[PDB]
């Protein structure tokens, strides 16, 4: 009895993260193979860490503030932001984050897509 | 009311169109379509649920593409392919289609899952 939705996420070519805001600092509790190929990290290097580690010297603080404020308000956000592979290579990340609420309205998870749009935006 | 499945919410909330089909029902019908798929194609959930994904094909669709998909599905193998499909509006578009079979622990086919993406502009160069 395999979960078809889990397999959807495991097999898609679109990078995806799930985080758990009931653990301290809202850490990644799942990253799909697409995310690990994109960024160069192993699963054990990203699980248990906040997604912040993708940010670096080029990252616009205005982008980071907007994400922080949407997460605190438990609201979704779409935004392009400069992020960094483990190698150190910069890329433009088209980032989509959505909160996941209980039936009772209690925040449970966050889920995200990430898409390298370096070539698109280079135009 | 149970804790909500994070992976189901991942697929419901992503902007990437996705379908799940059930090959143990007759004609391998769609049993889940995410809102991204309904935005892409223009259909309501009740117009696509319970149907084979074939309904997206039309006069422009290359039968060679359809044969290749049919043969991959019968062999329970994945396929990546661009194919002409049709929105409910009638507009034709290039669909970058990614299909994967989903196996049991025992290796028995259980579901198929797909991504779909309008790549009309990319392919138009
Ligand atoms: C599910 C999820 C995925 C995230 N993915 C990214 C990401 O791909 N890149 C990034 O720069 N920040 C990402 N973030 C944002 C950071 O984790 C963090 O929330 C951001 O830096 C704002 O907060 P801070 O000031 O506490 O670091 C993600 C956040 C969540 C909830
Ligand atoms: C999970 C899944 C998703 C599919 N999505 C599409 C789609 O978006 N577009 C399409 O043209 N065919 C799609 N198909 C392929 C058709 O449903 C069908 O298998 C194909 O037309 C070949 O078989 P046929 O000769 O019976 O029509 C999908 C099939 C599966 C299993």
Author numbering:
A (entry chain B): 19 to 141
B (entry chain A): 17 to 141
Publication excerpt:
LOV-HK is a blue light photoreceptor from Brucella abortus, a pathogenic α-2-proteobacterium that can be transmitted from cattle to humans causing brucellosis. The LOV and PAS domains are connected through a long linker helix denoted the Jα helix, while the HK domain belongs to the HWE family. Upon blue light illumination, B. abortus LOV-HK photobleaches as a result of the adduct formation between its flavin mononucleotide (FMN) chromophore and an adjacent conserved cysteine residue as in other LOV proteins.
The blue light sensing LOV domain is flanked by α helices at both its N and C termini, denoted the Nα and Jα helices, respectively. We crystallized and obtained the structure of a “blind” construct consisting of the Nα helix, half of the Jα helix, and the LOV core (LOVN13J21 C69S). The structure reveals a parallel dimer, in which the Nα helices intertwine and interact with the β sheet of the core. The Nα helix plays a central role in the dimer formation, interacting with the hydrophobic β-sheet. In addition, the presence of the Nα helix dramatically increases the lifetime of the light state in LOVN13J21, with no detectable decay for at least 30 h after light excitation, while the light states of both LOVJ5 and LOVJ20 slowly decay in hours. Taken together, these results demonstrate that the Nα helix plays an essential role in forming a parallel dimer.
